[PDB]
Amino acid sequence: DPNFFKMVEGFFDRGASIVEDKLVEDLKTRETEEQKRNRVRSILRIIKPCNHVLSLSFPIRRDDGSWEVIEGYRAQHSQHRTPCKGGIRYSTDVSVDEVKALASLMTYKCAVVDVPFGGAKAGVKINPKNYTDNELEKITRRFTMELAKKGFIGPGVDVPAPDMSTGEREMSWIADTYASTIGHYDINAHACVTGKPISQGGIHGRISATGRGVFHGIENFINEASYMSILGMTPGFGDKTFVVQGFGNVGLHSMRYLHRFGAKCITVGESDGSIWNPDGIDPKELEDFKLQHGTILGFPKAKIYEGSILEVDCDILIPAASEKQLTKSNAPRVKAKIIAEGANGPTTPEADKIFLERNIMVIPDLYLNAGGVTVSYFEWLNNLNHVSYGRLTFKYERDSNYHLLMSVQESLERKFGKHGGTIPIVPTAEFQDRISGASEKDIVHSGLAYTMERSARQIMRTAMKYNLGLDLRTAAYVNAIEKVFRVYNEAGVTFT
Amino acid sequence: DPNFFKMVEGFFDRGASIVEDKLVEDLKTRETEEQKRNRVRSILRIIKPCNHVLSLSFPIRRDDGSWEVIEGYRAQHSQHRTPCKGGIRYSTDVSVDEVKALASLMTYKCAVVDVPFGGAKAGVKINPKNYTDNELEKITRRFTMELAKKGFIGPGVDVPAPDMSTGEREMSWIADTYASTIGHYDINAHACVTGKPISQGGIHGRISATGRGVFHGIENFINEASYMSILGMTPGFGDKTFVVQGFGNVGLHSMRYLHRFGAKCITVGESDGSIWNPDGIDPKELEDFKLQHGTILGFPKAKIYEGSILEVDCDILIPAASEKQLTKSNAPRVKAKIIAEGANGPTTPEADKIFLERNIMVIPDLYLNAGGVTVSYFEWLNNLNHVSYGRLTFKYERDSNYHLLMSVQESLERKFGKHGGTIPIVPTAEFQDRISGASEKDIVHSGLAYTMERSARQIMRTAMKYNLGLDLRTAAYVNAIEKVFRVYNEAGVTFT
Amino acid sequence: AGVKINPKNYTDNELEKITRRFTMELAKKGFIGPGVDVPAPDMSTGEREMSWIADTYASTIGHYDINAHACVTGKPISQGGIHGRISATGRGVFHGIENFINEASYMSILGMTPGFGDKTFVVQG
Amino acid sequence: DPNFFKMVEGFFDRGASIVEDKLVEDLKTRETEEQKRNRVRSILRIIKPCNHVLSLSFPIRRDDGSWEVIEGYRAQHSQHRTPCKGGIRYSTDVSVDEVKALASLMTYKCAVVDVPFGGAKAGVKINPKNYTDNELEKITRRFTMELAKKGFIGPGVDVPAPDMSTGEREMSWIADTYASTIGHYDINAHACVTGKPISQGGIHGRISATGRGVFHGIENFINEASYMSILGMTPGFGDKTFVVQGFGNVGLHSMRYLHRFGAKCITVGESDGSIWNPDGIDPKELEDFKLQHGTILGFPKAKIYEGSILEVDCDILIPAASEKQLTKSNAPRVKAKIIAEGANGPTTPEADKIFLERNIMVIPDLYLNAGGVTVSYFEWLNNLNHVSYGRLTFKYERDSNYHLLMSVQESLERKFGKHGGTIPIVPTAEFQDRISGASEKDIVHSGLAYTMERSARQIMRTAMKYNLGLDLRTAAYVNAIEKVFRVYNEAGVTFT
Numbered sequence A, B, D: 001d002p003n004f005f006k007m008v009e010g011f012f013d014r015g016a017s018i019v020e021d022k023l024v025e026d027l028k029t030r031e032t033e034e035q036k037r038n039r040v041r042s043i044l045r046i047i048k049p050c051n052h053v054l055s056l057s058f059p060i061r062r063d064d065g066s067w068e069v070i071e072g073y074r075a076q077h078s079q080h081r082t083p084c085k086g087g088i089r090y091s092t093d094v095s096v097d098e099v100k101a102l103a104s105l106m107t108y109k110c111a112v113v114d115v116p117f118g119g120a121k122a123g124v125k126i127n128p129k130n131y132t133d134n135e136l137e138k139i140t141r142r143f144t145m146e147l148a149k150k151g152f153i154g155p156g157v158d159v160p161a162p163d164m165s166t167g168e169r170e171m172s173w174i175a176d177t178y179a180s181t182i183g184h185y186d187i188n189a190h191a192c193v194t195g196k197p198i199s200q201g202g203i204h205g206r207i208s209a210t211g212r213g214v215f216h217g218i219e220n221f222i223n224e225a226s227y228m229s230i231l232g233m234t235p236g237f238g239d240k241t242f243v244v245q246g247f248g249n250v251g252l253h254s255m256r257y258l259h260r261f262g263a264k265c266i267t268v269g270e271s272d273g274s275i276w277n278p279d280g281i282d283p284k285e286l287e288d289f290k291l292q293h294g295t296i297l298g299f300p301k302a303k304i305y306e307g308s309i310l311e312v313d314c315d316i317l318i319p320a321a322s323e324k325q326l327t328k329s330n331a332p333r334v335k336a337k338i339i340a341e342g343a344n345g346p347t348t349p350e351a352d353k354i355f356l357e358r359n360i361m362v363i364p365d366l367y368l369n370a371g372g373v374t375v376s377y378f379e380w381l382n383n384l385n386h387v388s389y390g391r392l393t394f395k396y397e398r399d400s401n402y403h404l405l406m407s408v409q410e411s412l413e414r415k416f417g418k419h420g421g422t423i424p425i426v427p428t429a430e431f432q433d434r435i436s437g438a439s440e441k442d443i444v445h446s447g448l449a450y451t452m453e454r455s456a457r458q459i460m461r462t463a464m465k466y467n468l469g470l471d472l473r474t475a476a477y478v479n480a481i482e483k484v485f486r487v488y489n490e491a492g493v494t495f496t
Numbered sequence C: 001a002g003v004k005i006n007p008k009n010y011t012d013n014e015l016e017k018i019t020r021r022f023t024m025e026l027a028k029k030g031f032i033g034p035g036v037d038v039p040a041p042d043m044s045t046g047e048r049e050m051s052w053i054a055d056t057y058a059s060t061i062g063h064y065d066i067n068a069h070a071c072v073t074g075k076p077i078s079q080g081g082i083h084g085r086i087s088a089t090g091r092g093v094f095h096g097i098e099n100f101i102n103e104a105s106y107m108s109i110l111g112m113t114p115g116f117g118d119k120t121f122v123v124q125g
């Protein structure tokens, strides 16, 4: 077990090393080889550390009257591409070392999936099992009056997001503050945080986002004859059978969505139990019982088959659970053919060899969980240009679309003036929904998948470019660094 | 040896404990005893930690072309009394733990000597023996474009100051930046740093300040019959003989100034040698040789008497050298009667007992070295109201003063119309200087001593109030906390 | 905006020291800013230059603005450019002619036959 | 006749050349001689040109309804010492070449008399004999909404002042605008212009300032035995007899004030006539007739003695008239012993030799007319700290002063308990005024002269330092450059 800071740190170190040779060859500015190679070895030392790390302390007054101090952190990994964005964690485990760590990932997520954001992360040492509906407000509404006074929250400088122990309810309290004290003289005030309640400028699909992100991740590689063959796998969701490592906000949806396209959810689990039914499991019923019973350990149409799901038959596995689900202490017990990581750091770097040595493909946790990030990047636009997506232009396409068919029909009337008479070219039931069920929702559902598409190809292009083969994690971090480098390389970073 | 963070931390912990009882008695707002006592025990937990701690990283490009990263810190101990102020250290030893530490002291210095400043401190990990006349500019001029973008430099939010390895030359580069990029639209831009070169808005006496601060420190207690008797000491500088622990920017002046009032400088030393001449030593000659020879180890009218000055005869000792000159490992070897500390943390808390047990008085390093701070507080005013001190009103008093004597003379002409005839009431040679040698300089030299005066009495009043007797350090930290508490107690600190 | 410089004199670095200064001046006097004024490339001013400008205005003054990087155009595509910033002017010239050579009201009066597929042209450089 | 731009330009060119050698010797930073000498020859190329020159054009709509364009200029000679300050001229002669010129002078005036201002100047092409009480408002109130939108007016960036065709009435219209549109959110808004009407934040003595400036100029050199002897002149105003070249806002006062100290105003003149009465002339009567008759050509107690006053007996001459009163075409016709220039460029550089060759002293027009500048620098402080000078502290000194005498009296009661009994030490009639006639006025009258004093000595020190002897103009420009250089030399001018 490494430090999750150190464990991620080591990743791009590898990635930096690999691109290193290729990159000097690719740069063109006429310089000395050693110079324009020690150059990139120097820029790549700039990208590694975080550029700002803020520590705080709060005079919070409790409900009983007493006071207490709240150690709270904030780190912006790089002003590389403003505005920085990252979640806000509430947990006593939060330490400045971990905040630096995540800030790194958020900077490379955004690089992967091409969203113009830097990377941030912020924690506070609070166990929300202690405070009330009210003290949390007195805290969050204070943790923003601090950051804002020091330029670490603002629609153009930095944008918080939800994290564990940080629901919608919280992010409302933030915006309700920054848009009332400091950002008041700004048109873009409510663009300060994402994941707001849909009433106050949210996005439909902020919850199911990450899950439906995981989905379009797999669908961009399972449709690749260049890997499915090499993986010894048959292309198609309708062909394969998968499993799930829990029922997080991810699992509940990642399951259901992939469930919707014929891939058979073999088994599932819990943070405190196991479930197994090797012949397909119903999402919705679970979505009932896990909320009807507070646990599916007792879902009747399955079995509590104690044991790691990670050791159970599956053509696709989703470690949709918390940190470090895998070590090489079970790498000989994968039972899978393709693993697509759900949360950050589920696998040690160690076992990653063995999976390659056992010849499978473990899609990296970089961009899979980054489905949510893009959705935030959309809510940060919805709020930014002050208009629901496409409300301006919804009835327009509705008009034109079946004001276009009416031409095809009319144009067929030439050849078929009397053969069959009138020919009512009409939509279908489905294509009627995409007309009548028009909503910003479907824009997201659309824009989301396409970002994942163009992204996931940028990786398969990378793996081919460096013969990494089934080394996606590296290639990903390679593909991220390749991008972040371009920005510095041209910025003439020296502002003096 | 403790951590200098922890070692200072422990100080006011004692101080907080002592005032604790007296303070609840002194508060009047009608509340429950346990409540309005757990109150103060809670406010006193707020004051301890720092409210902001910033960490940085710089893409500095060297002279040869290469890049490198510059870890740089900044800490504002409390927004208690804006604007915060503290020096900027250059040294590889700088670590976020020490930056928090000093930030505490600067907050209690200012509390002692009644200057409305919070407390800050900032380091960078640089050994200036590495860089050039130019890279330092490329660094400092960058370490301000960062802080300024995040609200940690600004004439109303925070004000840097010189520290070790940070001469005038540096502080110019800062102001030359903040007053050219961000603060440009501000009238108060050049109030951003103090210790600027006198040309660019400095103060005459910025160098000799700290020394002449040490002086008026002692003169406020050595003139106290309540202690000089108890110390078994004869009131008067013309009576006592002292020593000096080095020739810092402090010693060169603290010596010379106290030299000017009949107190006999017995011996002196160096960071790399000893000197002794138990019958008075000439400042100026040393101020020659230490600059003529780069060392006084060879000053002819003295001797290189190797051994700790701290173990040499003296009625007053000045540990005007770097951190932790004393432990109890020589507490039985004080040889002194009154010790007045020059730099921060020269003595372990341990030995402080023994000095009390050996019945001497060790004046705390809190306010002695804080002579310089006030002088900075003046340069921050000179720059603030855009006018040399008293240039507006210099010739006015010059007029009135000897337009007043001319009345006394003329009024004597009544009683003495013919007894002695004309009676030229005139000034003296000295009082002529205070007229003709009028300068902002003399204002400082004046305002400085009076701040030290009113301060040093606030301590002797405190020691009497709590029967601390010869416990000045405590009483000082007690007197500081007493003040800083008042501000929070009334602020209704909750901004939400 | 011009400056009196013959870029055949200075280096990869002095030009930076110049351009990055010619913006700290204008910006202090309200002549650069995404809502007040927007530079663009000209002769002896490639992409490389316009990067140095934005890299400055979006780091000293416009830092507290969401629209900072809107200060100049023709930036390198990495830093917020547009694909087709180079070939633009040319493909501009094209759609110019195509809007008049398809005009029977002029092609006739010009004694000209409407259509690109019909005509033969030349180029001055 | 040279271009007044070129003619001033040439001045400091000489001055730059002279200091050039001395200055490299004086700098200490260890560098190569040729390097740290080409250094100063390079800094001295920076100081020469203006750093900003703005040209404008106004859609002014006339009273009749028509439109017209108003070419208007503005030039800030150097951001060297913010805020820049200069007058606003209305005249059709105004051209960008002349605006650059004056901006230079205002930068060296301020350098001479030690007021922390840069230098500016602004004209518009208007002949105010054309427009009305109202169009001028529509113009001025527009020429500020333009400059303000581009950072050329503002209490910390730039400060206009009155010039020819620009009375109080105008400067009110400016402040009434900048303090109502843009500077509204600033506490320092009304500090934007000086010379405002006394009601709206002016200074008593804004008119008579320049004149009473000319006065304390001469009084600082005519009291110099080092020159009065060398000039073959007898020290004292009560000894000498002078003349005046007109009755400008300068002459009306420069005459009267020097009139008040026994120097005999021999003759005077007009822009359209001559006057002569070689036996002393009354200011006030002229101040009547020139306003009773609109001309003194007919003042009964003198004669209309046509001919250049510059060719008439005088121990002191004041060319208090407009540009280029002298050439060498009358240099053999000086008739004077000391000439003290009133307005800018009254003498060609050519004749200056001849005066030296005829062995007289022509005090430069740099600082003589700069008496007004300092007074503006005070109104820019009065407005800045929002309090009449000394109103806070007037009754305090009044108390202490004759609460001090009452001690001297009482203390004499010891020696003289019965010799003469009660001894009423009282003020005099005069010293009573300085008590009862206490006013911000007298502060100015005081602070003014002292600035001129400390200034005029900085010149006599300079002339001695470079053996310039009776070369004051040069020495002045030398003394200015010496100062302006210090600021750049230390600023590390490179902000990148």
Ligand SMILES: NC(=O)C1=CN([C@@H]2O[C@H](COP(=O)(O)OP(=O)(O)OC[C@H]3O[C@@H](n4cnc5c(N)ncnc54)[C@H](O)[C@@H]3O)[C@@H](O)[C@H]2O)C=CC1
Pocket: A081, A110, A111, A113, A114, A115, A116, A117, A118, A458, A483, A484, A487, C077, C078, C079, C080, C081, C082
């Ligand atoms: N030639 C290649 O390998 C690639 C080309 N592209 C081109 O760029 C376009 C896509 O770029 P968009 O971002 O959608 O539009 P854009 O105009 O904002 O492109 C900005 C560029 O910066 C990079 N970038 C994006 N987000 C970043 C971040 N957070 N940090 C650092 N770098 C980042 C992207 O590679 C992108 O090419 C496509 O049209 C495609 O033609 C994109 C990716 C790879």
Ligand SMILES: NC(=O)C1=CN([C@@H]2O[C@H](COP(=O)(O)OP(=O)(O)OC[C@H]3O[C@@H](n4cnc5c(N)ncnc54)[C@H](O)[C@@H]3O)[C@@H](O)[C@H]2O)C=CC1
Pocket: A162, A163, A164, A210, A245, A246, A247, A248, A249, A250, A251, A269, A270, A271, A272, A320, A321, A322, A323, A325, A342, A343, A344, A369, A372
């Ligand atoms: N919620 C969001 O918007 C995002 C969440 N994530 C990450 O996703 C992960 C969890 O997703 P959440 O959204 O937090 O959903 P959640 O909080 O609702 O997830 C908890 C689920 O994981 C299960 N679980 C926990 N430990 C397990 C273990 N060792 N084995 C099997 N099941 C286990 C629980 O029983 C439960 O079903 C975390 O790593 C979180 O940081 C990442 C990005 C966004």
Ligand SMILES: NC(=O)C1=CN([C@@H]2O[C@H](COP(=O)(O)OP(=O)(O)OC[C@H]3O[C@@H](n4cnc5c(N)ncnc54)[C@H](O)[C@@H]3O)[C@@H](O)[C@H]2O)C=CC1
Pocket: B081, B110, B111, B113, B114, B115, B116, B117, B118, B458, B483, B484, B487
């Ligand atoms: N009754 C007492 O024990 C004391 C009374 N005083 C009174 O206050 C006046 C002196 O205060 P000034 O500061 O010169 O004027 P001021 O009007 O600014 O006083 C502010 C008050 O806040 C406190 N203070 C000053 N600097 C501080 C800092 N950096 N942090 C926290 N608290 C700070 C001081 O005790 C002062 O009384 C004197 O006239 C005296 O009458 C001052 C000290 C002790």
Ligand SMILES: NC(=O)C1=CN([C@@H]2O[C@H](COP(=O)(O)OP(=O)(O)OC[C@H]3O[C@@H](n4cnc5c(N)ncnc54)[C@H](O)[C@@H]3O)[C@@H](O)[C@H]2O)C=CC1
Pocket: B162, B163, B164, B210, B245, B246, B247, B248, B249, B250, B251, B269, B270, B271, B272, B320, B321, B322, B323, B325, B342, B343, B344, B369, B372
């Ligand atoms: N310079 C300033 O404005 C301020 C300085 N200080 C503190 O004062 C102390 C030193 O004063 P500086 O101004 O830095 O002067 P400096 O840097 O010129 O002081 C160095 C002097 O101390 C002597 N020295 C060093 N270690 C010694 C040891 N163990 N025994 C005897 N002599 C020793 C050296 O030989 C030398 O004479 C430091 O603690 C510094 O932080 C504190 C506040 C302001």
Ligand SMILES: NC(=O)C1=CN([C@@H]2O[C@H](COP(=O)(O)OP(=O)(O)OC[C@H]3O[C@@H](n4cnc5c(N)ncnc54)[C@H](O)[C@@H]3O)[C@@H](O)[C@H]2O)C=CC1
Pocket: B198, B199, B200, B201, B202, B203, B387, B388, B391, B439, B440, B441, D081, D110, D111, D113, D114, D115, D116, D117, D118, D458, D483, D484, D487
């Ligand atoms: N050693 C010398 O030759 C001189 C020394 N001084 C010292 O400086 C003090 C007077 O300076 P103040 O301005 O009253 O206070 P200050 O603290 O503002 O001094 C600023 C310094 O910058 C220079 N300066 C002033 N106005 C300037 C301008 N507009 N442009 C460029 N440089 C300018 C002055 O020479 C002054 O020494 C006196 O106390 C005197 O001791 C002043 C003049 C000459």
Ligand SMILES: NC(=O)C1=CN([C@@H]2O[C@H](COP(=O)(O)OP(=O)(O)OC[C@H]3O[C@@H](n4cnc5c(N)ncnc54)[C@H](O)[C@@H]3O)[C@@H](O)[C@H]2O)C=CC1
Pocket: D162, D163, D164, D210, D245, D246, D247, D248, D249, D250, D251, D269, D270, D271, D272, D320, D321, D322, D323, D325, D342, D343, D344, D369, D372
């Ligand atoms: N008024 C002010 O605040 C300042 C005025 N000045 C300068 O002072 C000069 C004039 O002083 P103003 O204040 O404008 O007063 P003004 O406008 O009232 O001066 C005009 C006076 O000069 C006389 N005059 C004009 N040409 C003459 C000539 N060739 N020979 C003899 N007398 C002549 C007129 O008859 C009249 O008495 C100008 O050069 C102006 O720029 C400079 C700084 C400030």
Ligand SMILES: Nc1nc2c(ncn2[C@@H]2O[C@H](COP(=O)(O)OP(=O)(O)OP(=O)(O)O)[C@@H](O)[C@H]2O)c(=O)[nH]1
Pocket: A204, A205, A206, A207, A208, A252, A287, A441
């Ligand atoms: N489908 C589904 N939605 C849920 C569930 N629990 C909460 N939700 C919320 O209900 C919303 C339903 O989304 P809809 O807009 O009605 O339908 P959709 O977006 O086309 O697809 P689904 O989200 O899967 O229903 C989601 O956005 C979730 O935020 C669940 O168990 N299943």
Ligand SMILES: Nc1nc2c(ncn2[C@@H]2O[C@H](COP(=O)(O)OP(=O)(O)OP(=O)(O)O)[C@@H](O)[C@H]2O)c(=O)[nH]1
Pocket: B204, B205, B206, B207, B208, B252, B287, B441
């Ligand atoms: N006196 C003194 N001043 C020094 C010495 N070295 C440098 N200086 C500087 O020279 C200045 C001399 O100060 P002055 O204004 O001339 O005289 P003063 O302020 O009345 O008292 P001193 O500073 O002790 O001379 C001080 O401000 C120091 O900054 C030194 O060895 N002795």
Ligand SMILES: Nc1nc2c(ncn2[C@@H]2O[C@H](COP(=O)(O)OP(=O)(O)OP(=O)(O)O)[C@@H](O)[C@H]2O)c(=O)[nH]1
Pocket: C083, C084, C085, C086, C087
């Ligand atoms: N076509 C073309 N492109 C060039 C040439 N030289 C540089 N380029 C660049 O290459 C890019 C090619 O554009 P593409 O996006 O690949 O293709 P296109 O925009 O559909 O049309 P073209 O620009 O003509 O290729 C252009 O935007 C130019 O900036 C050239 O000689 N021909």
Ligand SMILES: Nc1nc2c(ncn2[C@@H]2O[C@H](COP(=O)(O)OP(=O)(O)OP(=O)(O)O)[C@@H](O)[C@H]2O)c(=O)[nH]1
Pocket: D204, D205, D206, D207, D208, D252, D287, D441
């Ligand atoms: N003395 C004098 N003042 C005039 C004259 N014309 C206008 N004034 C104004 O009247 C004011 C008179 O100033 P006061 O404050 O009353 O007296 P003072 O300042 O001590 O000296 P004077 O200005 O010479 O009277 C001056 O400030 C001028 O602005 C004049 O001819 N003589």
